[PDB]
DNA sequence: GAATCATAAC
């Protein structure tokens, strides 16, 4: 019932399921940080990245392939670039893969923490995580994630530094 | 005046 269990409730709601198969389910991010923003969750929950082991390798690969399928099935006309990844220190329970388009045009993207959670090392690429599991049997999340969320705003396309969220949103129009 | 930061949510 906690706010932090929200993903489990949503993924069980038939009207919220964008796609589902034997292993995973896709829901829209309720507070999307870009035009296209999905979350991929396994039916068998993973508590956290620390609990990930070599036994999850195939599932993590399946979550990745399902994310890419959803892009094709639902975002083909946009021509947007996408990234797939995990937040190093999530707030919502149940490990979930972010699948998010790189326009970052959304009213829900409101503050520096939002921006840096998709545009610093706090965002762990899905491919990088799969390789970590495939090679070490575990996901290593490096120390100091909270500080990355406070970094000054930097455009992800041209690396220009911006002083505020409104000016960043205005700057992003140059990359239409 | 606008935007951000720090803190709480019973
Ligand atoms: N009930 C919900 N259904 C879908 N997405 C949600 C829900 N509650 C929160 N979210 C999103 O889930 C993500 C949780 O962030 P994080 O824990 O950092 O991976 C955020 O991007 C939220 O916008
Ligand atoms: Zn730029």
Numbering used by the authors: 165 to 340
From the article:
The APTX RNA‐DNA deadenylase protects genome integrity and corrects abortive DNA ligation arising during ribonucleotide excision repair and base excision DNA repair, and APTX human mutations cause the neurodegenerative disorder ataxia with oculomotor ataxia 1 (AOA1). The aprataxin (APTX) RNA/DNA polynucleotide deadenylase directly reverses 5′‐AMP damage (Ahel et al, 2006; Harris et al, 2009; Reynolds et al, 2009; Tumbale et al, 2011, 2014) and associates with DNA repair scaffolds XRCC1 (Cherry et al, 2015) and XRCC4. Environmental and metabolic sources of DNA damage prompt “abortive ligation”, the failure of ligase to complete step 3, and generation of 5′‐adenylated (5′‐AMP) DNA strand breaks (Ahel et al, 2006; Andres et al, 2015; Schellenberg et al, 2015). AOA1 mutations map to the APTX catalytic domain (Barbot et al, 2001; Moreira et al, 2001; Shimazaki et al, 2002; Le Ber et al, 2003; Tranchant et al, 2003; Criscuolo et al, 2004, 2005; Ito et al, 2005; Mosesso et al, 2005; Baba et al, 2007; Yokoseki et al, 2011) and cause variable age of disease onset.
For five amenable variants (V263G, H201Q, S242N, R199H, and L248M), we successfully crystallized and determined X‐ray structures of mutant proteins as ternary complexes with RNA‐DNA and AMP. R199H: Arg199 forms a salt bridge with Asp269, as well as participates in cation‐π interactions with Trp340. The structure of the mutant reveals these interactions are lost in R199H. Trp340 shifts away from the protein core by 2.1 Å and the surrounding region of the Znf (α6) shifts ~0.5 Å away from the HIT domain. This suggests R199H destabilizes the HIT‐Znf domain interface and explains the observed APTX stability (ΔTm = −6.7°C) and catalytic (14‐ to 18‐fold reduced) defects. Intriguingly, the effect of this mutation propagates up into the region affected by S242N (α2–β4), and Ser242 makes an additional hydrogen bond to the carbonyl of Ala239. Thus, we hypothesize that by altering a common region of APTX these mutations may also affect a putative protein binding surface of currently unknown function.
